[PDB]
Design a protein around this nucleic acid. Structure first.
Ligand SMILES: Nc1nc2c(ncn2[C@H]2C[C@H](O)[C@@H](COP(=O)(O)OP(=O)(O)[C@H](F)P(=O)(O)O)O2)c(=O)[nH]1
Ligand SMILES: [Cl-]
Ligand SMILES: [Cl-]
Ligand SMILES: [Cl-]
Ligand SMILES: [Cl-]
Ligand SMILES: [Cl-]
Ligand SMILES: [Mg+2]
Ligand code: NA
Ligand code: NA
Ligand code: NA
Length: 326
DNA sequence: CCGACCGCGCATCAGC
DNA sequence: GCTGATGCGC
DNA sequence: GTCGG
């Protein structure tokens, strides 16, 4: 919050570029600048001061000057007044409606919450569930609820098969006092890079969580990734908890450390880290870290025994999850 | 300059 | 059906 | 929009 004013501005600009201009590199450019500035341990006093930070260029430096002088940005003022941009920005808040779908809906004169509701038949399944829980999915989850949710998921998974290991990642693993959703990494010894010795590994876990009425909706589901909806159980007479987004990612057990690094994030941290990997001549995904041949062809997976081995390869000092919140 | 910008699972569609 | 590109979300 | 070379 030290430079919250500026970081909010850049985020609003990032969002505009993603949702409206559909210009994803501009989106990431703003996001990066915002991240670098939020980290910065001084209250910024000028665009020039900011332009010292990596990712802040001439254009963002000028905007910071405008913002510092007036408390606002004319460019954003006009964006907010623009009915089309506002409408598009709103619709993209519904899970499953991206920039493209949003702009189409608006072309059809579907541009409000009331419009979506009376046009349920125009929505695919994911979008349908995003509209249903539009309000709930806006709310954050107190760590205390995250802790109850973890207890359920782990215990239920243990009931299915004691050899399952479920690890809650995302901001929860980074120590955050609230999380926008729940991210669960799942492994089982029968699923490795070498073989899948047991089918329905993910399905069976999902099934059991539906059985106890923890999972209530499915956004999408495949052999290794589930994205859906869950809800804590509430006591007699007490108001129900909000429905929450959940994702479960089944990863080969022998690739746990690359998987847990991936699912811990943050997203910006992953981008920064894989970008650095590339500078050092490696490529990192949720499975492996591989060298890049002189051609730039990924080589064979390097041995990984801890998250720190991954950091080591790219010559980064290790960073605890709680210091990966970029 | 100017090319590169992380990497990939699932849904959905076009074209064969 | 299949492959491949695209959207969208992680 | 920014940066590396
Ligand atoms: N390489 C890469 N990894 C990505 C990306 N988006 C999400 N991830 C990874 C890292 C997240 O922590 C993890 C979960 O994705 P997330 O969107 O839930 O983020 P998160 O870190 O959990 C948020 F802080 P919260 O949800 O708690 O409010 O998925 C992406 O674009 N690229
Ligand atoms: Cl772009
Ligand atoms: Cl403003
Ligand atoms: Cl690994
Ligand atoms: Cl791989
Ligand atoms: Cl930590
Ligand atoms: Mg999360
Ligand atoms: Na800079
Ligand atoms: Na959306
Ligand atoms: Na998630």
């Amino acid at each position: 919050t030290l430079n919250g004013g500026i970081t909010d501005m850049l985020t609003e600009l990032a969002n505009f570029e993603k949702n409206v201009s559909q210009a994803i590199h501009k989106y990431n450019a703003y996001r990066k600048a915002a991240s670098v500035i939020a980290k910065y341990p001084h209250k910024i006093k000028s665009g020039a001061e900011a332009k010292k930070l990596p990712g802040v260029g001439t254009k963002i430096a000028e905007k910071i000057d405008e913002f510092l002088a007036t408390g606002k940005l004319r460019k954003l003022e006009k964006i907010r007044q623009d009915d089309t941009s506002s409408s598009i920005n709103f619709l993209t808040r519904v899970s499953g409606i991206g920039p493209s779908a949003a702009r189409k809906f608006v072309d059809e004169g579907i541009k409000t919450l009331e419009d979506l509701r009376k046009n349920e038949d125009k929505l695919n399944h994911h979008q349908r569930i995003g509209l249903k829980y539009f309000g709930d999915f806006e709310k954050r989850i107190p760590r205390e609820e995250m802790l109850q949710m973890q207890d359920i998921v782990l215990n239920e998974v243990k009931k299915v098969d004691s050899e399952y290991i479920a690890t809650v990642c995302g901001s929860f693993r980074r120590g955050a006092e609230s999380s926008g959703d729940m991210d669960v990494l799942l492994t089982h010894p029968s699923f490795t890079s070498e073989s899948t010795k047991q089918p329905k590994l993910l399905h069976q876990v999902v099934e059991q969580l539906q059985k106890v009425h923890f999972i209530t909706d499915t956004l999408s589901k495949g052999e290794t990734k589930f994205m859906g909806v869950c809800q804590l159980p509430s006591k007699n007479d007490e108001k129900e908890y909000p429905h929450r987004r959940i994702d479960i990612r089944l990863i080969p057990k022998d690739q746990y450390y690359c998987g847990v690094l991936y699912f811990t994030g943050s997203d910006i941290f992953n981008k920064n880290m894989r970008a650095h990997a590339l500078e050092k001549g490696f490529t990192i995904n949720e499975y492996t870290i591989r060298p890049l041949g002189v051609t730039g062809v990924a080589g064979e997976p390097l041995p990984v025994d801890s998250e720190k081995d991954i950091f080591d390869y790219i010559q980064w000092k290790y960073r605890e999850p709680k210091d990966r919140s970029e």
